Every structure is written in structure tokens, then in C-alpha cells.
Swiss-Prot record, chains A, E:
Annotated NADP(+) binding sites: 12-17, 40, 62, 75-78, 101-103
Official protein name in the record: Pyrroline-5-carboxylate reductase 1, mitochondrial
Organism placement in taxonomy: Eukaryota, Metazoa, Chordata, Craniata, Vertebrata
Alphabetical UniProt keywords: Acetylation, Amino-acid biosynthesis, Disease variant, Mitochondrion, NADP, Oxidoreductase, Phosphoprotein, Proline biosynthesis, Stress response
Disulfide feature: none
Regulation: Subject to competitive inhibition by the reaction product proline. Subject to competitive inhibition by stearoyl coenzyme A.
KW Phosphoprotein (keyword) present: yes
GO cellular component, one term: mitochondrial matrix
Places the protein is found: Mitochondrion
Catalytic activity: L-proline + NADP(+) = (S)-1-pyrroline-5-carboxylate + NADPH + 2 H(+); L-proline + NAD(+) = (S)-1-pyrroline-5-carboxylate + NADH + 2 H(+)
Swiss-Prot record, chains B, C:
Enzyme Commission identifier(s): 1.5.1.2
Keyword match Oxidoreductase: yes
Regulation: Subject to competitive inhibition by the reaction product proline. Subject to competitive inhibition by stearoyl coenzyme A.
One Pfam entry name: F420_oxidored
Residues where NADPH binds: 11, 13-14, 37, 39, 59, 73-74, 100, 233
Single Gene Ontology BP annotation: proline biosynthetic process
Name of the protein in its database record: Pyrroline-5-carboxylate reductase 1, mitochondrial
Record organism: Homo sapiens
Modified residues (N-acetylserine): 5
Residue ranges that the Swiss-Prot or TrEMBL entry lists as coiled coil: none
Binding-site positions, L-proline: 167, 240-241
GO CC field: mitochondrial matrix; mitochondrion
Annotated gene: PYCR1
Compartment(s) of residence: Mitochondrion
Enzyme class, spelled out: oxidoreductase
Length: 279, 276, 276, 282, 279
């Protein structure tokens, strides 16, 4: 029964992540779409057309987003952020909470830009992912220097309505990006391949995609609701001499585990290295 | 345009491909094209003569003939060309650089020492312009007029796909569609070897493999659907195609093509860093 | 021909592709085509209705409507189809099997029990017939008349390449151009991933990669030259393309495509051995 | 013939494998008298020195004697020895000399820099050849230095053409040539040894497998050199559908055969450059 | 100064191998092209058009080749041989020497077919390669049951005019096929790759192809004229610490030698397995 009656939300950027969050927030009922405004340099994006359908207010002008909004999501590419902050810095007021969703972009760099216009900008850095669109996102956030205690509690309330949300120290966020920020792409790749495997063995493609996705969904839910180690749940499904343990062996023979470690590491390192070139 | 005069500095594979595509398209008569080369014995130069293109060993004569000037020389030769003909660039000229990696900044810097406001366009095209199915991107320079970009798009659209991009995308485009045809020629040779291994005559295997690739690419271009969806559409359960897809996956087929785009892009950037 | 009536048993991806190509080509009006399927809710069936193709759940009605009868069902369904409609085959009928691996002998054996001298043609086509760039081979059966092979070649030539082959080549053709589009869709997805990794927007990367493959395939088809010679022509010394070719070679890129043709061909043969 | 009646005196500083291969080739060609060649080495106990002796080549431990004897002076020592050689006999190079460096990686510029401190216009040519000059089937490229006369390049081409293919290139190609045809015979010797092993594994006597593999490679190379055709086209022409040859080509592809030969040319070229960059820093 | 004045040669099959041998024999001067006849089911082959240019007599009918010829080369695909022998078996005379060039096809299978029509067919089995076209072929042959001593000496004289030729026991020929029969294809692949390597390092393609081919030609000639082991010649070119030994290492690291062993083995096994399916 959550609802932020006194809150206006703006998205600078109207891409995949802005659409997912707006759809999540509306589907949760915590915000009405008409209290959400999004701006984009390209008003012909398919995400823009969809936001219009939901009732979200659209404008080409980032300044109008800022003037309309209390909570301002920066949902542009990381290299776009300094240009955004240059453009609207003089429009940031005391009432604004600036929530940066950009991968790698530090609270320090955002506060430094905005402090040139007005001291004490209220900045929160977050890393979320697109499954907020089905209210099963995974979000972490870190509060900036001038964020009030009520600011983070409020953002946790909002982002908890679309998935898991928790506060972290900012120096964990690049690693979170490699795990749950990039995570859904790893899963989509895995589901495409599992479906290909089902088709090879004779399943219709539609059934194979549905079964694979359901298997992944249920296994993740099992882990989330269990106090048990994932290796323990693996043991419970691996019947002696059976089909599952034979398949696990061929995963191990290809170094399956190391590829996923490789992936989290690669996404995290890229995230840091993008920011370091920015700075 | 009709009154438009075009010149090529460099008369190698790319200049021939472009001149052949332009004249096949009808947008340009061969007599309105002139080309120069340090080597007037190249096969590409003899072919251009058969088509009716004017040839010269002197780059200055090509410049004086031309309105649109294509630089189709190797990237390391561009600075030398610019030094040799920079004093001959007029206000009427549009200089279109085709060299991999060579930046608009480096070209404008060289030419601006002879005359300010050089109209410079950078493009990355590929050799299939010779059959009017090229892939071309271009970026306009500091002093390029709006009509200059539209003239370029009109000309290059006649021999394939053409769109304007920001210049910082062009090295990646080089790795993808600039080098792309070579990946496809390698693949077509291998697919033909495979057909021959399984009993097909070579001439038939080459024709079938090439037709298969053309038709698939055309399908994707004419479809709104994802390439994996099209792959799904043609992968019958338990069948031959899905068995073959598996063996490609087992060799990391996808990663090799990603590697290739990356390597070509990185080499393109690296060559320019050595230039500057 | 104009008076020619065509039927499809099976209304999946291949039947739609063929009907769409045939009607786009102009050789066949949609109203002279009829299709049947055990599942009248498939997307392919709804699309065929929009085009104006007649639909039915009863294979017998398709047979009675048709002069040329395409069997576009899965290979394991062919024997069942033949048992169900074998008594409805007339002398006027030409039965064109599209099923991977299914031999003319097995089809003639089934049908000859109902009426002697069935006119049977086996082909291997592919889905790019939907954009009139298919690759098709066919072999004529024991009782196929000379005009039957020329009618088939005329029809299938309207939607792509078509040539007659000896039947023992068809399983290899399946591995090459039958499964070929799927290899190309996989490659185009990966090439797009590569362009995206190097900074390109996805929509642009897909378009450029697909255009690059189309143009290269068209170049080879229009050239008398070897694919390695065309590769040589586009591999500038020390440049980006030759660097990218090396990384493909280092992963055994060529061998993977050979593997794929072989695996699809072998699976095609293996399925038929299980049939018989 | 016309080179013979020029009665050139040739010197080699360095009496190793390349000096012996060139001396053998030149004398077999009839362009030089063995006793009109002089070679020097700090190590007079090398086997190649003993072979040169038997040929009739004059040998001396004194590099100055080789310089004074010579009209054309080949520098055939290893690359790191070249700057010490140029220090030692730089004062003895005369205006009449053509100095031909065969050392991998060593630039004309580095040689002229040393020699220019003595006489002002040293005539320098850089070449990359290979040991098959010994059977007059070498692959040679050369580049002419700042003060090399046009007649010097022509003379060099005439001489080296007597022992194989020879052509002028810009100097910036020579490190790559080194990785390809300078090191190339070693790749072929490795390949011939392995093909012979494969012959032996399948039941052939070693002597026959060596002969047949070598004849196959020789004939294939000659076919290519005499054909206006792409090597892939020649490959297509011999690969019968479904046959033994295309099956063998597949297993070469599956091991990345092509990439290993590219790796080899690259590794030899890069090493050649790396040794020069080390010398030019010092 | 060799010349077979009293010899007519026929080729059944007019493909790559027949053209190479006819061009080799004519270039050697041992046969005039007008004393050579070739037949082919396809008179539009590019090889057929070239044979016509040399002056070789062409006919669609294998029977005419047999009637014209003394020495009859079977230069068709192996699976074509039994059909050829069925077609012309009744036309084989006492004067004919039948030289089969087909990979894998045994003397026993040929003699069995031809003996049904007339006893004591004179059969020689050979394995040659296309470099006979430049008179640098590599040929081995085995004499059949009814071949006279003069028959093999004659075929060795003829085939020696276009390259190396020697008699072997028939059970070596499948292995020879894997080594020198398929050998030139291995070399063409290697030369394409070496040229690619030269181009990568900055050489024009034309120069790289010429240098690579010359290097291979000279090295093979060096080995043929030396009494020394190929490893010894390798040692003579591998200067300590130098460029060549660095390149040899990277060949070894990829298992270069084992790939060539793999190749000879694969071609030999395929050759045997084709014949075993024939029998
Ligand atoms: C670019 C990006 C990555 C990436 O680098 O792949 C990963 C997670 C989120 C984001 N997003 C989305 C919107 N703005 C961002 O930074
Ligand atoms: C050299 C080159 C590459 C490369 O580096 O492989 C790639 C694409 C285009 C070009 N061209 C063609 C003419 N001038 C260029 O720069
Ligand atoms: C099943 C199939 C394969 C395969 O086995 O992957 C390959 C090519 C065509 C076909 N089709 C389509 C319709 N009926 C068939 O047999
Ligand atoms: C050392 C060397 C290599 C190598 O580095 O392997 C390659 C080619 C030639 C030479 N030679 C021979 C005499 N002096 C040289 O530099
Ligand atoms: C088919 C073939 C192979 C092979 O199987 O690749 C190898 C060597 C020779 C032959 N030839 C040529 C003519 N008739 C033959 O058998």
C-alpha cells in the first residue's frame, strides 16, 4: 500500500533503463505515470513511444524534466553524464535528489560538477537492472555527501517496489555492475543456448524457451528462499549415476564456472576503466 | 548532379570499385571521372581506361579536373598527398577521404595551411560498391556545408547503403563493414571446402554457399526480426541445421567474428596513433 | 504456367517462404495456391491467409486442388503423409518433396503401391526464397517427364538460384545451402555483437554487417575470381583487414564452417538411415 | 658471363652458413672464380670455413685483408657483430667499394652513420637472401643506400640473380621479407621432416618419404610460380570432391595450420625488428 | 633425347590430371600432342578446351580413345573406374597397357573386371600429381600380374620425363597418395598462409606470393640435392637467438609437425576407405 503522493519523478534519458523503471513504478502503483516526465535527445526511440503509451510526460528539453521533478534519475550513457550535468547544473534546486544510474560514474564526479552551480547537491548513485520492468530488479545504491538520511530511506522504498534493493558502500558498485547489472544478459545468453540444446534433442523452440526460462526462474527462487548453499541444492538434484550429474560433468569439463567468473570480472573491470578514462 | 566532376587520387581496388559502381548506377558518366596513381601499370588503372575514366600520373591534374575529390590511397600516403596538392585545393572542392583511420582533424590541419576552410568529408566504404551493394558511412568536417553531406549521401547511396555517423564511430565501422567482405570471402572459401568434402563439385559449392549467404543477408535486411529469431525459424528440432549450429558453437564461432571486428578496429585506431 | 495449381502439405516456415516468393515473383497468383496443416493456428498459416492462399486442415483437399504438390513437412512425417494421400495421387500430379534426406526411392515406393508411375521430384531449397534469393537444387524421379524437370526449374528459378543435380548430391547441398542461412544468421548476430563492443549502436551494427555480407556474396557471384583472390584484393598490407583475418585463422574459423557443412550433411544422411 | 669477364673480387666478412651458400652459388653459376673470393672469420675452426677452403676460397683471420681484397664486400656476420665490424674496418672502406650488408634487421642508416665518419659517400646496399642460393634458387631482395650508384643496384641485381630470384625493394619491406623468405627455408625443412614422418607412419620407407615429400613441395612451388593463378585456385584444382586430399586439408584447417605460418612470419619479422631496436638504442 | 615414335597415348577422363600429364609429355618433347587422344563425358570442361589448344585429339567416346591408343591412362575419379572398365573392357587388346591413375583403386580390382573380357590384361597402377604439368611431378607405379618387364621400364621412361618416378610395391601407393599425391595441396595452402603472413607484416601480396613460393622451391631443391637430414638443414639456417629460431618455436608451439602428419594420415586413410567401400 505504498504511494508517493508528494513526489514527482523525472528521467533524463528515455532508453531501456528509464522505460523499465517507469513501467516498474507504475505497475507497482507507487507512482502514477502522469507524475513522471522523461526527456531524450531522440524522441523517436521505441522506448519513447512506449512511455507515451503509459501516460508518461515526454519533452525534448532536460531543463523541463528538472523543473518538473523532485527525484531526478540520470539514465543516460556514462559518457553523457558530464554533458547533462553541465546543461542542467544551474537548474538543480535544494528539493532535488539526483539519482545517477550510469555505470561507473562516481558520486565524487557528479557532486564536483553540480557543486560549481550550487553547494550541497543531494546525490545518490544506484546500479539497477532491466528486470525492474517485471518488479524483480536487483538494485544497490550509495548515498552522497549531502544526501539526507531520509533521502536514502526514500530511494530504498521506491526501488524496493520494483525488486530487491539495499544500500552499499560506493566502492562495491562497480562489482555489482558486473554481477547483477550485466547479469540478465548472461541469463538471456544462457537461455538462448539452453533452448538451442532443447531443439537439438527434438523440442519445439517455443516449448524449449518456456521450459528453460521456467527452470532458471524456479531455481533462482529456490535459492532465494533457501538457507542452503547452491552446491547443496545442486547435490539434492544430482541423483547418483543419473542424467543430471552426467550433464554437470560436461559443464565442468568446459570450465563453465570459470566463464561466469570471467564475465563478472570483465564487466567490473570495464566499468572501472570507463570511469578512469572519464577522470 | 550532372555537371559534377569527380576525381580519385589513388587508382587501386577501392577507386575502381567506386568508379565502376558510380557509372553502373548511372549517377556519373565515366568521362566525368579522373584518376591518378604513382603506378600507371596497375591492372586497376587499365580497367578504368576501358570504362572511359580519364587517367593521369599527376595528382595536380586530378585536382584541377575535380569538384569532389576522393582520397583513395593508403592511410600512410594521405599526409604526403595533402602536402603535394594542398596548394591546389579551391573553395569549390569537397575532399572525401576514404583512408582507414585518418581523421578529419589531421586532413583539415594539413590543408588549412594552404587555404582556410577546406570542405572535408571522411567516409568508410567497402569494395561491394563495385556491384552497387556497398556499406558506407561518412562524417562531415568543420567547414563542410549542409549540401556537401547531402551530395555525399546521394552519391554513395547509389552504390549501396549510406548513412551519416559521428566520426568517432568510423574506426568501429571499419572493423565491421570495412573489413567485413574479407571475413565473408574467407567464410565462402571454407563453406565451399566443406561442400567439396561432402561430395559437391567446387563450382557448385561456391555458387550455393555464396547464394546462401546473399539470401540470408537479404532476409535479415528485409526482416524486422532478430537474427536469432531467424535462426530459430530455420532450425528444425533434432534436424541437420541445429546439429551444424552446435559444432559452430563448440568452436567459439561467434567469438571469432567478435575478435575480428575488434582486431580490425583496434588496428585502425593504432595506425592513426602512429600517424599522429 | 498460368493454369498451374500449386499445393503445400505442411504450412510451416518453408511453405510460407516459397508461397511468398512465388507470388512476389509473379509466376503464381496466391489464389492458385492451397496449403494444409495439422495445426491451423500457426503464425505461418495466418500469414498465408493474408496473402490470399487457400487454407484447409485436410491434406486430401490440397491434393485434389493441386497439379504440383509440395511436401513441406518434417522428414519423419513424409511416410505418414504418403500413406494418407497416396490413393488421391493422379497421373496429372507432380509430387515435389522438400524434406531433408528423404529419398526419391522411399517416396516412389510408398506412392507406387496406390498408383504406378508417380511423378516425383526431390529438392533442397532454403528460406531466402522468401526474398527471391533462395538456393535450390532438385533431382527428378524415375517417372518424371522431361517437361516436369523444366517446369520445376522454371518455377524455382523465379525465387533464386536453381539447378538440377544427381540425387546423391542433395544431402551435401543440405549441409551447405540448406543449413547455410542459419550459419549466416549466427555470423551476423556475432558480427553485430562485435560492432556493439567497439562502440556501434546495435541497429547500425546489424545493418552494416548484413550489408557487408550481402555485398561480398554478390561480388563473388558476379566475379570469375577465386574467393581468396577477392580476399587478397581487400587485404591491404599491414592493415586492419589482414590483422582481423589473422585472428579468424587463429581460431580455426575455416575449419568450423567445414565442420558445420559436414555435420549437417551427416545428420541428414543419418536421419534417412533411421527412416529406412 | 658478362659478370665473369668483369673479374670481380668479392669479400665476405663472416664465413658462416650464408657466406658459404653465396660463395658456392656464385661459383656454381660461373660468375666468380672461387679464388677471387676472400672470407674472414674470428673463428677459423668453423666447418663452413673448412668447406670454403676446399672450394678454393681465400681465407684470412684479418678483416682488413678481406676489405683490401674486395670490390664488392658482403657483410655476412650476425647482426650484433655489425657495429664492431664497421668500427674495425671503417677506415679501410674505399670509394671503389660496394658494401652489401646481409645482416638481418641492420638498417642502411646505421651502416652509413658509422662509415660516413671515414669516407663521406660510402656505397651501401642492404639485402636479405637465403641459403637456397647454394643450389641457385635463392630468394633475394635488396635496397640501395644514399650513395649507391644506379649502376651499383644493377650490378647487385645481376650478381644475385645468378643464384635465384632477386628484386629491388624499399628498405622498409626487408624485415618482413626476412620473416617470409629469409626464415622460410627453415619452415620448409620442418614441414619436410614432418611430412616424411607422416609418410613413415603410413608405411613408407624413410628414404622414399623424404624424396617424395620434397619433390611434392618443389613441384607445387614451381607450379605456383609458373601459374597466373591464385594458390587457392590451385588448391581447388587438386581437391577432388569427397576425396583424400580434401579430407587431409580439413585436418590441416582444424589445427589452424594457416595461422601457424602467419604466426611464424610475424614472429621472425618482429624479432628482426626487435634486435635492431636493441642495437640502435645502444 | 627421348621420343616414343611408335606409341599412341590415350586418356580416359579429361580433367586436371589428364591435362597436366599431356602438357608435361608434350613440353618434354617425348610425345607430339597429335599422338594423344582424350575422352570425357563433358566436352565443355576448361581442361578440355585447353587440350584442344595444345593439339590433343578429343572425342566424347571412350571406345575411340581405346582404339586409338597403345598406352591408356585411366584419369577418372575412382568411383568412375568400374563403369569405364565395363564400357571398354571388350575393346582392350593385347597391345594395350592400362595405366590407372585413380586414387585407391587396386590392380586386383582392375584385372578382375578386364579379365572377364580377355585374359591377361596388362595393368599398371600409378599415383602421380599435378606438378607433372611443369615436369616436376612425383610418381610411383606398381606393375600388375600380366605386365611385362618392358611395360614397367617403358612407363618409368615416360613418367620420368615429367618428374621423379620409381617403382613401388602396390601396398605403398595409398600412403604415397597421402604424401605426394595430396602433397601439392598442402603446399598451396601453406603458400597462401605464408603470403598472408607477409601481407600482415607489410609486403605487397604479389611479392609475398613470389617470395614464399621461391623459398619453398629452393628449400625443397636444397634437400633433394643434399645428403643431409632436413633437421640438419634447419640447424644451418637457425642462427642462435635470431629471427628464424624464434619463428620455429611458434610453429612448434602450435604442433605444426603433427598437423602435417595428421594430413598424410588422413589422406591415406580416406584413400583406403574409399577402395574398401568400392570392394
Ligand atoms: C551502460 C550500462 C552498463 C554497461 O556498461 O554495459 C551496465 C549497466 C548499466 C548501464 N547503463 C544503463 C543506462 N546508463 C548506464 O550506464
Ligand atoms: C587500408 C584499408 C583498410 C585496412 O587497413 O585493411 C580497411 C578498409 C579500407 C582501407 N583502405 C582502402 C583504400 N585506402 C584505405 O585506407
Ligand atoms: C528439417 C530441414 C532441415 C534440417 O534437418 O535441419 C534442413 C533443411 C530443410 C529442412 N526441412 C524444412 C521442411 N521440411 C524439411 O525437411
Ligand atoms: C641471423 C640471420 C637471420 C636470423 O636472425 O635468423 C635470418 C636471415 C639471415 C641472418 N643472417 C645470416 C648472416 N648474418 C645474418 O644476419
Ligand atoms: C581423386 C584423387 C585424389 C583424392 O582422392 O583427393 C588424390 C590423388 C589423385 C586423385 N585422382 C585424380 C584423377 N583420378 C584420381 O583418383
Amino acid at each position: 500500500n505504498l504511494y508517493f503522493q508528494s513526489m514527482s519523478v523525472g528521467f533524463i534519458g528515455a532508453g531501456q533503463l528509464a522505460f523499465a523503471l517507469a513501467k516498474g513504478f507504475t505497475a507497482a502503483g507507487v507512482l502514477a505515470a502522469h507524475k513522471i516526465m522523461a526527456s531524450s535527445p531522440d524522441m523517436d526511440l521505441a522506448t519513447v513511444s512506449a512511455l507515451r503509451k503509459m501516460g508518461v510526460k515526454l519533452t525534448p528539453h532536460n531543463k523541463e524534466t528538472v523543473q518538473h521533478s523532485d527525484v531526478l534519475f540520470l539514465a543516460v550513457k556514462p559518457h553523457i553524464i558530464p554533458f547533462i550535468l553541465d546543461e542542467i547544473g544551474a537548474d538543480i534546486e535544494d528539493r532535488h535528489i539526483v539519482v545517477s544510474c550510469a555505470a561507473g560514474v562516481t558520486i565524487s564526479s557528479i557532486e564536483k560538477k553540480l557543486s560549481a552551480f550550487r553547494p550541497a547537491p543531494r546525490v545518490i548513485r544506484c546500479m539497477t537492472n532491466t528486470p525492474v520492468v517485471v518488479r524483480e530488479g536487483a538494485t544497490v545504491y550509495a548515498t552522497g555527501t549531502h544526501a539526507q538520511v531520509e533521502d536514502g530511506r526514500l530511494m530504498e522504498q521506491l526501488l524496493s517496489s520494483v525488486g530487491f534493493c539495499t544500500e552499499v558502500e560506493e566502492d562495491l558498485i562497480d562489482a555489482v555492475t558486473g554481477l547483477s547489472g550485466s547479469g540478465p544478459a548472461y541469463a538471456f545468453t544462457a537461455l538462448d543456448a539452453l533452448a538451442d540444446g532443447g531443439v537439438k534433442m527434438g523440442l519445439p523452440r517455443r516449448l524449449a524457451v518456456r521450459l528453460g526460462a521456467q527452470a532458471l526462474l524456479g531455481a533462482a527462487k529456490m535459492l532465494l528462499h533457501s538457507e542452503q548453499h547452491p552446491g547443496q541444492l545442486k547435490d539434492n538434484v544430482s541423483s547418483p549415476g543419473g542424467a543430471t550429474i552426467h550433464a554437470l560433468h560436461v559443464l565442468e569439463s568446459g570450465g563453465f564456472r570459470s566463464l561466469l567468473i570471467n564475465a563478472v570480472e570483465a564487466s567490473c573491470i570495464r566499468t572501472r576503466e570507463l570511469q578512469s578514462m572519464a577522470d
